[PDB]
Amino acid sequence: GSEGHRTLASTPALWASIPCPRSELRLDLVLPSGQSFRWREQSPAHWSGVLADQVWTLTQTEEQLHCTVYRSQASRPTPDELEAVRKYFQLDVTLAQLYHHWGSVDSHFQEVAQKFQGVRLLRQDPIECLFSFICSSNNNIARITGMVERLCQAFGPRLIQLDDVTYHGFPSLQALAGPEVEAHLRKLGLGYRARYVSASARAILEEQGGLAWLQQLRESSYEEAHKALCILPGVGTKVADCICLMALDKPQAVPVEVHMWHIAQRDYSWHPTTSQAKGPSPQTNKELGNFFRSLWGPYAGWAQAVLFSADLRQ
DNA sequence: GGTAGACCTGGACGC
DNA sequence: GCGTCCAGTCTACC
Ligand SMILES: Nc1nc2[nH]c(N)nc2c(=O)[nH]1
Ligand SMILES: [Ca+2]
């Protein structure tokens, strides 16, 4: 009862609601789609993970997003804690307005959107976003998710335990920059990205000016931000775009990799024109990104998330 | 200045 | 059962 992960039905008094129609958010299409790798459906329709340094379990009904938090007497989330959730999901951005616009300028989008409503972008923490996507290159979501969990258990602050799961906060720069982190990460299976993690943590702390340097990119322009990030080891144009889009508030950033290339060719009959190559390459990848921005506009990155998410399910 | 490969890891097919 | 695929970044080179 008071033990293990909660369900809306098991502990009614501990949940609080946030008005949110399924049309504005579908947890099942957002949480396991490669935006964040830290949420798990521990119980059917109930997703648990760390949000704003605390463990939460989320679940939804047709018109409500139900939330519960494990912090000391167990109690429902406060209005302020709930705002933390609203902010994580950027609920002030009306998805219905965006879907309308995209669908109006892109007939293909309209068709896909009908069956994949509620795919919005999470507003993630820069550090977590940076290192999680550093682990994402030349990799699959399943493996990435494992890698990220092991990284947090080994170097992140211990939070609370539910059932046999011990939640950890994401590691700090100081921790990832520590001595012998690379070796430990290799034993955890990060492969060659183990060095990228250690090297990038040290680079930010010892060559770029610290956490402030990263957090500052939020106020900088997409072009500036994207350029700064590519300086870090293991961070190319794609990883940088993911970080810009999901943690630095650059809604126009469009991450281009295999999935978007497939979508471009199959659903838009797209082909590079200005680029030299015919297939994927730094020149053609940049061109595709421009194509999507030209098609969808200022929130092209968000539109990308809808089709990308839909392409995973497919 | 724009390519070819090599690359940790492990679930997928293909046979 | 097994060998080749496959889910971006970096770096020798033409
Ligand atoms: N385009 C794109 N690539 C991704 N890779 C990972 N890991 N997540 C994403 C995503 O949301 N979009
Ligand atoms: Ca690939």
3-state SS string over A122-158?
Answer: CCCCHHHHHHHHHCCCCCCHHHHHHHHHHHHHHHCCE
Residues A309 and A312: their CA atoms lie apart, in Å, by 5
Q: Point out the ligand nearest to the CA of residue A262.
A: 1
- Give, in order, the Cα–Cα distances in Å from A269 to each of A169, A265, A266, A311: 43, 5, 6, 16
- Compute the CA torsion angle A286, A292, A295, A298 (nearest 10 deg): -100
N-terminal to C-terminal alpha carbon distance within chain A: 38
Cα–Cα nearest to A222, from A198, A202, A247: A247
Structural domains of chain A ordered from first start: 1-89 (3.30.310.40), 93-113+254-312 (1.10.1670.10), 125-250 (1.10.340.30)
A84, A207 contact by CB (below 8 A): no
Does nucleic acid strand B have an atom less than 7 angstroms from the CB of A237? no
Does nucleic acid strand B have an atom less than 7 angstroms from the CB of A160? no
Q: Which residue's alpha carbon is nearest to atom 1 within ligand 1? A: A255
Residues A8 and A163: their CA atoms lie apart, in Å, by 17
Contacts of A106 (CB under 8 A, 6+ apart): A295, A296, A303
A150, A55 contact by CB (below 8 A): no
Does nucleic acid strand B have an atom less than 7 angstroms from the CB of A284? yes
**Alpha-carbon torsion A80, A215, A185, A156, what sign?**
negative
Way the structure was solved: X-ray
Cα–Cα nearest to A258, from A279, A242, A240, A278: A279
Phi-psi label, residue A74: left if phi above 0, alpha if psi -120 to 50, beta otherwise? beta
Residues A147 and A141: their CA atoms lie apart, in Å, by 10
Secondary structure (3-state) at A57: strand
Tokens encoding A76: 């429902």
Tokens encoding A100: 């309308």
Phi-psi label, residue A269: left if phi above 0, alpha if psi -120 to 50, beta otherwise? left
Q: What spacing in Å lies between the alpha carbon of A260 and ligand 2's midpoint? A: 12
Residues A99 and A114: their CA atoms lie apart, in Å, by 9
Nucleotides on chain C that have an atom closer than 7 A to a protein CB are 6-10
A208, A235 contact by CB (below 8 A): no
- Compute the CA torsion angle A290, A137, A120, A149 (nearest 10 deg): -170
A217, A195 contact by CB (below 8 A): no
Residues A191 and A178: their CA atoms lie apart, in Å, by 18
A303, A102 contact by CB (below 8 A): yes
Residues A202 and A206: their CA atoms lie apart, in Å, by 6
Contacts 24+ apart (CB under 8 A), A147-152: A147/A188, A147/A189, A147/A190, A147/A193, A148/A37, A148/A38, A149/A37, A149/A38, A150/A188, A150/A189, A151/A185, A151/A188, A151/A190, A151/A197, A152/A38
What are the b/e assignments for A41-63, b being 16+ CB within 10 Å? ebbeebbbbbbeebbbbbbbeee
Residues A268 and A18: their CA atoms lie apart, in Å, by 38
Q: Which residue's alpha carbon is nearest to atom 3 within ligand 1? A: A255
**8-state DSSP, A310:** H
A115, A124 contact by CB (below 8 A): no
Does nucleic acid strand B have an atom less than 7 angstroms from the CB of A145? no
Q: How many CB atoms lie within 10 A of CB A226?
A: 20
Tokens encoding A241: 């775009």
Q: Which residue's alpha carbon is nearest to atom 5 within ligand 1? A: A34
Tokens encoding A2: 């008071």
Contacts of A87 (CB under 8 A, 6+ apart): A123
Place of tokens 């322009």: A221
Gyration radius of chain A over CA positions:
20
Beta strands A46-51 and A16-19 are unpaired
User: Which nucleotide is closest, CA of A312 to its C1'?
Assistant: C7
